[PDB]
Amino acid sequence: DLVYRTGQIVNVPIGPGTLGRVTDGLGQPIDGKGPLTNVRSSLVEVKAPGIIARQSVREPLFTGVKAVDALVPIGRGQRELIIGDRQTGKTAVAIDAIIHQKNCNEQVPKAQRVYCVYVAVGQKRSTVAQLVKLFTQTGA
Amino acid sequence: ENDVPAILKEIDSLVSREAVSAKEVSDAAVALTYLQVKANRRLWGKVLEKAGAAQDYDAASLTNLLWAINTGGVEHFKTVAELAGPAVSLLPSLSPVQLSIVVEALGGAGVKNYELYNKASAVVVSKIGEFKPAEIARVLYGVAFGGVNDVALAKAAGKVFASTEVDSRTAAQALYALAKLGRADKATVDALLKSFKKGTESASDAAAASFALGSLSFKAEKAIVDALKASAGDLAPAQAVEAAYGLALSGATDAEAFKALFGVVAPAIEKAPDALEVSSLAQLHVASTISGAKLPAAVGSFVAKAFGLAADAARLKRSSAESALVADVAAATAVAFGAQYRPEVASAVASYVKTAPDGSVLDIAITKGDAKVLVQAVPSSLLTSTTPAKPLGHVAAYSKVREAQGYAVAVVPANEFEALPDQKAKAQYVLAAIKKVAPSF
Amino acid sequence: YLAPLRSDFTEEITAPKVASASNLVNEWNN
Amino acid sequence: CTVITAEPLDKLERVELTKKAEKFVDAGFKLVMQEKIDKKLLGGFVIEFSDRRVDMSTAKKVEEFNNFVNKLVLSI
Amino acid sequence: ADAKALDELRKPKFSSKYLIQHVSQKLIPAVK
Amino acid sequence: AVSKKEVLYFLSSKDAESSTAVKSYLKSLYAGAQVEATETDASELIAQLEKKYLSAQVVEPGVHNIALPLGESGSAPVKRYAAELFNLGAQAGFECPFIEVSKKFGQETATSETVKDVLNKTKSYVSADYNAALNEVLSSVEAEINGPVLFDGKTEGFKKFAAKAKAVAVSRGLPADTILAYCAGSANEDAADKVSKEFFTWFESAYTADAAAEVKAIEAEAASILDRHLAKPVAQIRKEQASAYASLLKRAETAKGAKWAEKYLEDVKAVQWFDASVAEAPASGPKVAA
Amino acid sequence: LTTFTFSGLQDAPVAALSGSIKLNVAAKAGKAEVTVAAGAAKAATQVSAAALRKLSGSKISLAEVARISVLHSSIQNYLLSLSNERYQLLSQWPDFTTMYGKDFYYRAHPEDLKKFYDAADEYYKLYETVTEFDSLSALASQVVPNYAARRRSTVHPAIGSTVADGAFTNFLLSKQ
Numbered sequence A: 001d002l003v004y005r006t007g008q009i010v011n012v013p014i015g016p017g018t019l020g021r022v023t024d025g026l027g028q029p030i031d032g033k034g035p036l037t038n039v040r041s042s043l044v045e046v047k048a049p050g051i052i053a054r055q056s057v058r059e060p061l062f063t064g065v066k067a068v069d070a071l072v073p074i075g076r077g078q079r080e081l082i083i084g085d086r087q088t089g090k091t092a093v094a095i096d097a098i099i100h101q102k103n104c105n106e107q108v109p110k111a112q113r114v115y116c117v118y119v120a121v122g123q124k125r126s127t128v129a130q131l132v133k134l135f136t137q138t139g140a
Numbered sequence B: 001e002n003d004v005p006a007i008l009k010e011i012d013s014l015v016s017r018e019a020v021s022a023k024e025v026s027d028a029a030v031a032l033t034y035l036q037v038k039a040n041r042r043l044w045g046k047v048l049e050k051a052g053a054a055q056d057y058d059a060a061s062l063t064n065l066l067w068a069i070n071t072g073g074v075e076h077f078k079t080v081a082e083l084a085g086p087a088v089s090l091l092p093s094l095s096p097v098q099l100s101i102v103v104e105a106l107g108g109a110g111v112k113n114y115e116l117y118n119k120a121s122a123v124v125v126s127k128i129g130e131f132k133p134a135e136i137a138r139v140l141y142g143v144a145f146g147g148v149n150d151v152a153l154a155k156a157a158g159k160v161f162a163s164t165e166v167d168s169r170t171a172a173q174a175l176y177a178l179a180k181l182g183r184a185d186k187a188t189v190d191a192l193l194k195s196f197k198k199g200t201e202s203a204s205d206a207a208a209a210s211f212a213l214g215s216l217s218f219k220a221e222k223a224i225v226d227a228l229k230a231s232a233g234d235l236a237p238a239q240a241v242e243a244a245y246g247l248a249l250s251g252a253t254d255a256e257a258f259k260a261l262f263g264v265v266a267p268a269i270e271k272a273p274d275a276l277e278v279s280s281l282a283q284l285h286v287a288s289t290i291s292g293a294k295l296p297a298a299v300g301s302f303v304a305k306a307f308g309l310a311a312d313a314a315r316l317k318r319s320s321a322e323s324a325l326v327a328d329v330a331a332a333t334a335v336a337f338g339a340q341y342r343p344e345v346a347s348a349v350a351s352y353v354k355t356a357p358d359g360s361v362l363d364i365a366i367t368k369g370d371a372k373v374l375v376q377a378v379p380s381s382l383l384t385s386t387t388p389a390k391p392l393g394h395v396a397a398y399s400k401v402r403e404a405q406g407y408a409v410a411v412v413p414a415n416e417f418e419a420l421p422d423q424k425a426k427a428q429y430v431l432a433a434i435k436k437v438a439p440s441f
Numbered sequence C: 001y002l003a004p005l006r007s008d009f010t011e012e013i014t015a016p017k018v019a020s021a022s023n024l025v026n027e028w029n030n
Numbered sequence D: 001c002t003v004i005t006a007e008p009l010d011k012l013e014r015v016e017l018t019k020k021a022e023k024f025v026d027a028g029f030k031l032v033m034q035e036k037i038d039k040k041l042l043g044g045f046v047i048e049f050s051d052r053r054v055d056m057s058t059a060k061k062v063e064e065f066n067n068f069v070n071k072l073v074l075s076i
Numbered sequence E: 001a002d003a004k005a006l007d008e009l010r011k012p013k014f015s016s017k018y019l020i021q022h023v024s025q026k027l028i029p030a031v032k
Numbered sequence F: 001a002v003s004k005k006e007v008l009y010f011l012s013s014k015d016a017e018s019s020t021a022v023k024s025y026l027k028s029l030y031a032g033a034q035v036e037a038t039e040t041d042a043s044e045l046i047a048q049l050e051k052k053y054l055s056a057q058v059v060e061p062g063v064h065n066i067a068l069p070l071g072e073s074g075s076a077p078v079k080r081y082a083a084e085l086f087n088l089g090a091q092a093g094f095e096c097p098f099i100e101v102s103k104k105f106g107q108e109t110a111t112s113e114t115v116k117d118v119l120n121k122t123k124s125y126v127s128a129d130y131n132a133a134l135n136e137v138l139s140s141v142e143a144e145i146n147g148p149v150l151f152d153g154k155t156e157g158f159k160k161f162a163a164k165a166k167a168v169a170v171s172r173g174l175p176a177d178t179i180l181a182y183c184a185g186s187a188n189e190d191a192a193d194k195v196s197k198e199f200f201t202w203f204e205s206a207y208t209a210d211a212a213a214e215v216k217a218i219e220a221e222a223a224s225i226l227d228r229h230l231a232k233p234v235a236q237i238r239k240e241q242a243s244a245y246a247s248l249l250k251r252a253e254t255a256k257g258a259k260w261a262e263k264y265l266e267d268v269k270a271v272q273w274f275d276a277s278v279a280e281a282p283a284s285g286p287k288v289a290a
Numbered sequence G: 001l002t003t004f005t006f007s008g009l010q011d012a013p014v015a016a017l018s019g020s021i022k023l024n025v026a027a028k029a030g031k032a033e034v035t036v037a038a039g040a041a042k043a044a045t046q047v048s049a050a051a052l053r054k055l056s057g058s059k060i061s062l063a064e065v066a067r068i069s070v071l072h073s074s075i076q077n078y079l080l081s082l083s084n085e086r087y088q089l090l091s092q093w094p095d096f097t098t099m100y101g102k103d104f105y106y107r108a109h110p111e112d113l114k115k116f117y118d119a120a121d122e123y124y125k126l127y128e129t130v131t132e133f134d135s136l137s138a139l140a141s142q143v144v145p146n147y148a149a150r151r152r153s154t155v156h157p158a159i160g161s162t163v164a165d166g167a168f169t170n171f172l173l174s175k176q
């Protein structure tokens, strides 16, 4: 079989048109809501920003979970591992963080609004229809 | 005792009520045509609203309404084309004169109702001995301008127009209908034109016969052009444009009639140039260049630019089988000048598309030194409907107006061109047609 | 009374998808 | 290489095809071009160099034309 | 003021006609 | 203004703001101006594209000037509606829809030598329950021969396909014999008249049936959206339409400089003028100068 | 219309057929004695056969002055004609105000009286929302864009399925 090269490294559509859309692992939509409008292509593997590009992590990111917000607090710009065994509530903490970002996004100005991305790696396909049902039910 | 705005106010109060029937709105339309109420358009709008709103129609009131719409110079396509339902439903109920007025007024407005024209054509060609020739000319005008190319009623009309003696306006309406149909049968037209001997009462008949003999290209008659010489005040500027165009197309050398018609149309243009379409302005440029009768200093340049506009717009909205024919005639012209391979043919046909001096686009423009030769194609919309199938008068006009710019026009008909089996025969035909008008190419 | 302005073409030729009858008249009769 | 065209070539169409095919070789390599016909191409040529393809056919140009005007009207 | 015209009142108002022009004056200069 | 190719399309059209620009253009040309030379360039992809986007500017205001015959008795309002649409297609630069969609078939399938691909490339332009009916007889003939049926015309498998395709065509209700007798013709013109007077009867019945189907679909959409609207309270209806009016005003004047936005706001000011002139004297309608 | 027409003082209306306006002409050789009389007022002039053919020179060209469009006015006219059909069945609603008295209050079950008062409130909701006639002009703007997009076809404004199937039978049952 003939293999043609496309000349381009793997890229995905980024932009504000990706909001509200269920995409697959390559940026193509799977929600059946037509093609992605108002987007632009960008590479999936960009080099991470260096030392002078950083800033000290000072402003909080509220998850809405009071154990996390009280004891194990998160700042904006932080990597926080949700580690545990199966069926202990890792996805529940993540979805509560996303829903609380929707709830906080209504009472803040345009600048300090948090836009969430949920990546579902290797999950069941009926599980991620429950999540888009819950996100369209809550408004998130 | 006598006040026309008094009965106008009574009429506009009559058609302002809500329970208006078909009969009083027919009578109000008739009373508006009998009193020349062109200047007040809202009363015509009220009577046409209440005419289109009526439900049940008899024969006489529908015939009076359609006669009133036809005679009064009013058109509205929605309410007139919606009257064809009462026309179809009452068609066994109509008399021949009523059927003639109905089909004439519905064809003259351009109503696309092929069921009405077929069901009227069948009852005309079945029972034609009871039809007066003016009534047959009315049904022929209706089927002709309705968009139907019905040759059965055309032949059955030509039989009557050769067997009977007809009036002036009957023969003029039949000539206008045949010119719209584009048939140009000799034995029908010369039988129709034996009636223009008493002098015409109205110049609309002479102008319609002028445009008909111009578009059918028989020749000028020396009796119609006398009526246009004397009665050139009974015409609109848009009417006298069609008159002068059909005169200049039909070989009329009588330049005083062109003087009398251009002295009508040019004050209307220099008063307000927006009154006519650019098709009429193109026809006026044709009639100015062919006859040679001078227009004023602002009108001639205006119609010369407007002919380029109209020809280029007829090029943009080309029939798209004429596009294939123009590409084929350009390819055969490239082969005729010598091109055995395909990039030579493509480079020639991309080079043949030079610009006319007024701003138009000519598809085949050949230049050798200082002489120019144009090759024009006439596919099917510019040929007559009959089995001779000669080109119509409008492309004789196009040739005569491009020849004034310096282009020796070699016309290529499509009954001749693509009936040939191969491309070298088409190149032979194109070169033999170029050498007929220009042996230097 | 405003309509959103659209600039799009229909490439296909489709039957115009007649919608089914709403149940309002028998509900109001109920 | 092999060349796919829509029509059987003329000998001026052929020598002009080699004028454009030589610019897809980055040397003075005079090619051993053969010919082939498939009229699903809308005119033009497809040069299959046995490791790279150059699709200068019009049938791909009218598809890249349609894919170009279908993405501007979604943004404009 | 009042009583504008007839050829100005014959215009259908909320037809598009200008998103068609906003595309075609930004497509044909961009596709040529 | 106009780029001189829009003004060439607007000559045959009879809508208002095209005729206004045509009259202003020739009023400019009368008072000592020069008509620009037309571009003898822009090869056929660009030519077909700007032909499409210029015929759209003649279709789009002409569609809004054609009254729908919703809820009318008889066929002549539907014949009026289809006649207005046909004359609009003529003024826009299109030919007859028979000619135009046959040109579309011949354009899209210029290379399809197989009947399977000429059915699977005109699938968007024919009805799906007729594409299925032709795929039925296609599979029946290619199961009869166990060989593909080619789009040649003189392969005998193609004729054994067409012998049943004409049967399903006359089973659909359309006379294929009169259609073929019009589009091929005969020698004597009195027989051409006899086949044209049946082809045009079928053609009129077909386009008025399709226009009546579009009218019935618009009637069903209006009835459905009214019965969805008549189930609401009045305050919900008023706030819904007020929010929609506010959103469609915001979407207009947030993007300024674009000609469609200023035309939109001129049109809403013209609607307000219409309401004012009707509220001045409601028995005389709007004030029209004459 | 066309450029020239061929009607006037020949096979013309000679009389009127209504009583609200009566008409009589004189079918002479050349001219006409027109006598129009609509009710109280009466007018009379003379027109010739060469003067009725001068009438159709400059055309009237009637056109419609609509608030938004003729398309939008047609869709709003259909919405008004359907709202009349709904109003006609809200017109045969039984009169509940003849059962508001306290001799009907205290004879009745409490839940049935609550149902009766909720039914009266339901009729008031339906009757207030069927006579909101200022919402039809914004309802008809929702039928306009999808319909106008359906008329912006790449083939033709007036293309249908039956015409396309007939032309596809013409395309298929010919060679190539």
Ligand SMILES: Nc1ncnc2c1ncn2[C@@H]1O[C@H](COP(=O)(O)OP(=O)(O)OP(=O)(O)O)[C@@H](O)[C@H]1O
Pocket (backbone or CB within 6 Å): A085, A086, A087, A088, A089, A090, A091, A092, A093
């Ligand atoms: N805070 C909570 N209160 C009550 N129930 C909870 C809570 N958090 C999680 N659960 C329940 O625990 C179950 C597992 O939750 P969740 O899916 O978030 O864990 P998980 O580790 O992502 O599971 P898995 O590894 O199977 O994906 C869910 O059914 C949920 O209903």
Ligand SMILES: [Mg+2]
Pocket (backbone or CB within 6 Å): A090, A091
């Ligand atoms: Mg999980």
